[PDB]
Write a protein that binds this DNA or RNA. Structure first.
Lengths: 226, 82, 59, 142, 182
RNA sequence: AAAAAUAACAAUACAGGACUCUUUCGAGGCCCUGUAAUUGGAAUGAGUCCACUUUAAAUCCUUUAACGAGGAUCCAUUGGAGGGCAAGUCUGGUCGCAGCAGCCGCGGUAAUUCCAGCUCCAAUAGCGUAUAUUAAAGUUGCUGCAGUUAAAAAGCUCGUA
RNA sequence: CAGACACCAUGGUGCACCUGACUCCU
C-alpha cells in the first residue's frame, strides 16, 4: 500500500490563469506561442491518453581519472493520439531516474502537430497536408502523406511517432546513418513540428494578433504578484 | 487551416506577422504581440484599448522589429509628430 | 593454418542424452490448433490477472 | 553531385552512369565471371562432389574450438574445395571418397566465422542428407 | 495454364504485434491458419489501391466509371460494401473483417446450427448445410446478399432433414447397438 | 498454383470477468475455455464402396446405398528462443571442449548461444536450405549520391569534340 | 628582456550489458 499525490503551484502568470480556469487548454498557449515551465499545466488540461514511450535508455559514458563514469541516456516520449506529441531525454545514473525524469521532460515538451488530408477535403484529419522532413546528424527523415487505409509505412521508430500524432497514413524514405536510432527520432521530431510550419493557403487567412493574456488578466493575476 | 466549407481540421490557428508575412507558431520564443495604448486626441487621458502587433523571433533575431513596428505604429497611427 | 587432425566428434553428444514426452492430450493439428492458440491465451478466465511474463519465461 | 545537364545529355548519362557503375565491387566481379571462375558456385545452386579428405581444422583465434572441415573436389566443377562440416558428431558420417552435395555456406564468396578460407558446407554427406543424419532421420548406408 | 497465389507475404518476418494480431482474426472468425488471414490480406491491399487509382483518375472516365461502378456493384452484390456511401473515399476505409462476416462460416455462426466458430467451420466442412441447391464445402466462400437467405440443413445431413449417410445411423446404432446390446 | 482436413459441440467441474445478493468477504452468475472424468446425442470424408457417371476407352472428379472418431483419435510439420529476431534470466550435461554463430556472438564450470530434455514461439502441408536475382539501397543516387577534413576537383591554363 | 643546454632501447591479457506500476493494506 502506497499512493501518490499532486499539489498545484503557479510559478508564472500562466499557471495562475491555468489554476483559476482562465486558460483552459494548451491550444490557447499553442496559439499564444508562450513558454511553459510547469508540466502540470499540461496535466491540468489533458491528464489523459498521453502515452509515455520509453524509446532507448542507452548507456553512454565518459572516461575519468579513475576508470570511467557512465549514465543512462533515456528517451521518453509523450503523446496523445490527437495531434499532440512530446519527447524527453534524461541522462541519469539510474535507469528509472532517467526514465521518470524524461517522463516529465516529455510532459513539459509536448507540442502540437498539424494533421490534415492527403487528397481528401473532409474526414477529420488522417495524415499531413504536406510532405515534411527533418535531419539530425545527416539522417534525413522525410514524410509523405498517404490516403486512408494505407497505413504508416515506416521504420518502427517513426511508425510509433506518426501513430502518436494521429497521422495514420504516411510514406517514408530515409537516408543517412543506419544505426543511430536516437538521431532517427530526433530527426523525425523535426518533421512533425514542421506541419504547422508549412504555410497552407488555408493559413493565408491571417489572425487578429491576440493581446497577451498576461496583460488581459493582469488585475485578475493580482494574487501576490500581477 | 481549415477543411471543407465550415469544417475545421486544425487544432488551432497560429499567429502571424505583418513585417515578414510569416506565421507565429506553437511555442515560439521571443514571438510576442506588441500592445500599444490608444492615447487620445488632445483631450488626453489615454483611451483604453492597446494597438496590438504580433512580432516573431525571426524578425527579432534578424533585428528588424524596431523599424517593423515603426512600419506598424507610425504607418497605421496614432503617434505624435507623424 | 595448415592443421587437419580431428580430435573429438560428438564429445558433448555422448554425455548429453534425450527422452520423449507423450501426448496426454494430442498435438492438435492445423485448424483446431491455431484456433486453440487464440482462445487459450485470452478467454479461459478472461485475463484480469498478472504482468511481466512470456509464455515460457522463468523471467 | 556535380554533373552536366542539358537536352542532348541522354548520350552522356548513358555512358556516365554505367561507367561509374563499373566501379562497384558487386557489379564488377559478378560481371567478370570470376565468381563462376574462382568459385565453383555462382554457376550452381547445389553441386555434388567427391570428398578429397577430412580436415580437422583447429580454429584461428578467436572462438577457440576445432572446426573439423572436409575437402571436396566437385564433379560438375572439378574444383578442389574445402567445405565446413556442421552437425556435432557427424564428421563421423564422413569418409574420404565419400561423394557429397556441397553448397555455399552463408557468405557466397568469402570466409565465415572464426575460420578463414572456408566458405562452403555440405548439404548431403554421402549424398544421403547429413541433416537427416544429424536428426537421425537417415542412417549412412555406406 | 495460368495460376496465381491467393495469399500474400509481408516484408517483415517477425513483427510479433502483427503475429498475435493475426492470431486474433483466426480466433475471432474461425480460420485455418495465417494463410486465411493472408488470403484476405492478399485481396484487400489490391482493393484499396484500386479504390486509390480510380480516385486519382479524372472524373467521367468510363474506365473510372464503368469499371468502378462494376467495382461499386461487385462490392455491394456480395454485401461487403454498401452502396449508400458508394464512393472511392469510403472504399479506402474498408477492412478485412467486412469480408470475414460475409464468409459462409460466420453467417453459419450468426444464423443456424453453429454454437461456435469452431463449430461453424465444421458445419461447412462436414457438409451439413446447403446454401442453395448446393452442398457447399468451402468456408471461405464469401457470400452475397441472396446467399444468406437459403442456408439450410443439407439433404446429406440426416439430422435436420436429409438422406441418411452412415452417421445418424451410427447415432441410431448408439441406440440400436449402443443400446441394443449388439 | 487453387480450395483447406486430421474433429467439433455442449454437459460437468473448476478458474474467475461483469452481473445479483452481500459492508465486503463470500454466494448466486453466465461468456465460458483450458483442464477433468467423460461422454451425450451430433457429425464428417481422410477412407472403403455397390451404383450412376466419366471419356477414344477410360481415368480421376462429382453422385453415392452402405460402412469409417470420445480417444494418447482418423494422433502435422518445418524452423527459432543470446541479440538482431518472435519465443527458455528453463532442466540437465558439457566447460573456449564438443559444438554453436548469415552478422553481432556463446562454450575457458554455477552455459539464457553448445548438446540435448522440457517449455515456448513461428509459419504450416508445408517449412527450411543452397544458389540466383529484385527491392530494401538515395551503397550507382535519371528522379535523387558523395567529392575541405570519411572514398572522390586533374599541377595549372588555353582549348576542340 | 641582455652569460654557458650530451645520449637514454624494449615490453603484454576477460567481466561498462537493453523496460513501467505504489493492494507493507497502514
Amino acid at each position: 500500500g502506497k499512493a501518490g499525490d499532486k499539489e498545484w503551484l503557479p510559478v508564472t502568470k500562466l499557471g495562475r490563469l491555468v489554476k483559476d480556469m482562465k486558460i483552459k487548454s494548451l491550444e490557447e498557449i499553442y496559439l499564444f506561442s508562450l513558454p511553459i515551465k510547469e508540466s502540470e499545466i499540461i496535466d491540468f488540461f489533458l491528464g489523459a491518453a498521453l502515452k509515455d514511450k520509453v524509446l532507448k535508455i542507452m548507456p553512454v559514458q565518459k572516461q575519468t581519472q579513475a576508470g570511467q563514469r557512465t549514465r543512462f541516456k533515456a528517451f521518453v516520449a509523450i503523446g496523445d493520439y490527437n495531434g499532440h506529441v512530446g519527447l524527453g531525454m534524461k541522462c541519469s545514473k539510474e535507469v528509472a531516474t532517467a526514465i521518470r525524469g524524461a517522463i516529465i521532460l516529455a510532459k513539459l515538451s509536448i507540442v502540437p502537430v498539424r494533421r490534415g488530408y492527403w487528397g481528401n477535403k473532409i474526414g477529420k484529419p488522417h495524415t499531413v497536408r504536406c510532405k515534411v522532413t527533418g535531419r539530425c546528424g545527416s539522417v534525413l527523415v522525410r514524410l509523405i502523406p498517404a490516403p486512408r487505409g494505407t497505413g504508416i509505412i515506416s521504420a518502427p521508430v517513426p511508425k510509433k511517432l506518426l501513430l502518436m500524432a494521429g497521422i495514420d497514413d504516411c510514406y517514408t524514405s530515409a537516408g543517412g546513418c543506419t544505426a543511430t536510432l536516437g538521431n532517427f527520432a530526433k530527426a523525425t521530431f523535426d518533421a512533425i513540428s514542421k506541419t504547422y510550419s508549412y504555410l497552407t493557403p488555408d493559413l493565408w487567412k491571417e489572425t487578429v494578433f491576440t493581446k497577451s493574456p498576461y496583460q488581459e488578466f493582469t488585475d485578475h493575476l493580482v494574487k501576490t504578484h500581477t | 487551416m481549415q477543411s471543407n466549407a465550415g469544417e475545421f481540421v486544425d487544432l488551432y490557428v497560429p499567429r502571424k506577422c505583418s513585417a515578414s508575412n510569416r506565421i507565429i507558431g506553437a511555442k515560439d520564443h521571443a514571438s510576442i504581440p506588441m500592445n500599444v495604448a490608444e492615447v487620445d486626441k488632445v483631450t488626453g487621458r489615454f483611451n483604453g484599448q492597446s494597438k496590438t502587433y504580433a512580432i516573431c523571433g525571426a524578425i527579432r533575431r534578424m533585428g528588424e522589429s524596431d523599424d517593423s513596428i515603426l512600419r506598424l505604429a507610425k504607418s497605421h497611427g496614432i503617434v505624435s509628430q507623424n | 593454418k595448415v592443421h587437419g587432425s580431428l580430435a573429438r566428434v560428438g564429445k558433448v553428444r555422448g554425455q548429453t542424452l534425450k527422452v520423449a514426452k507423450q501426448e496426454k492430450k494430442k498435438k492438435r493439428t492445423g485448424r483446431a490448433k491455431r484456433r486453440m492458440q487464440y482462445n487459450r491465451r485470452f478467454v479461459n478466465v478472461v485475463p484480469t490477472f498478472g504482468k511481466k511474463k512470456g509464455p515460457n519465461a522463468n523471467s | 553531385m556535380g554533373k552536366c545537364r542539358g537536352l542532348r545529355t541522354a548520350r552522356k548519362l548513358r555512358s556516365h552512369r554505367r561507367d561509374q557503375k563499373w566501379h562497384d565491387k558487386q557489379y564488377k566481379k559478378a560481371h567478370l565471371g570470376t565468381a563462376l571462375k574462382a568459385n565453383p558456385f555462382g554457376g550452381a545452386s547445389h553441386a555434388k562432389g567427391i570428398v578429397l579428405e577430412k580436415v580437422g581444422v583447429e580454429a584461428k583465434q578467436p572462438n577457440s574450438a576445432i572446426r573439423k572441415c572436409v575437402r571436396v573436389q566437385l564433379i560438375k566443377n572439378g574444383k578442389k574445395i574445402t567445405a565446413f562440416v556442421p552437425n556435432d558428431g557427424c564428421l563421423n558420417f564422413i569418409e574420404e571418397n565419400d561423394e557429397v552435395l556441397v553448397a555455399g555456406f552463408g557468405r557466397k564468396g568469402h570466409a565465415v566465422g572464426d575460420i578463414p578460407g572456408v566458405r562452403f558446407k555440405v548439404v548431403k554427406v554421402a549424398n544421403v542428407s547429413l541433416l537427416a543424419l544429424y536428426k537421425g532421420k537417415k542412417e549412412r548406408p555406406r | 495454364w495460368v495460376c496465381r497465389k491467393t495469399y500474400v507475404t509481408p516484408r517483415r518476418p517477425f513483427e510479433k504485434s502483427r503475429l498475435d494480431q493475426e492470431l486474433k482474426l483466426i480466433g475471432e472468425y474461425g480460420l485455418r491458419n495465417k494463410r486465411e488471414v493472408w488470403r484476405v490480406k492478399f485481396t484487400l491491399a489490391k482493393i484499396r489501391k484500386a479504390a486509390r487509382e480510380l480516385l486519382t483518375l479524372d472524373e467521367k472516365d468510363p474506365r473510372r466509371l464503368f469499371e468502378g461502378n462494376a467495382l461499386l456493384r461487385r462490392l455491394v452484390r456480395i454485401g461487403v460494401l454498401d452502396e449508400g456511401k458508394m464512393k472511392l473515399d469510403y472504399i479506402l476505409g474498408l477492412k478485412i473483417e467486412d469480408f470475414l462476416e460475409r464468409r459462409l462460416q460466420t453467417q453459419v455462426f450468426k444464423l443456424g446450427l453453429a454454437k461456435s466458430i469452431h463449430h461453424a467451420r465444421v458445419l461447412i466442412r462436414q457438409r451439413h448445410i446447403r446454401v442453395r441447391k448446393q452442398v457447399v464445402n468451402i468456408p471461405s466462400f464469401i457470400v452475397r446478399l441472396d446467399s444468406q437467405k437459403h442456408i439450410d440443413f443439407s439433404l446429406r445431413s440426416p439430422y435436420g432433414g436429409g438422406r441418411p449417410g452412415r452417421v445418424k445411423r451410427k447415432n441410431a446404432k448408439k441406440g440400436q447397438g449402443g443400446a441394443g446390446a449388439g
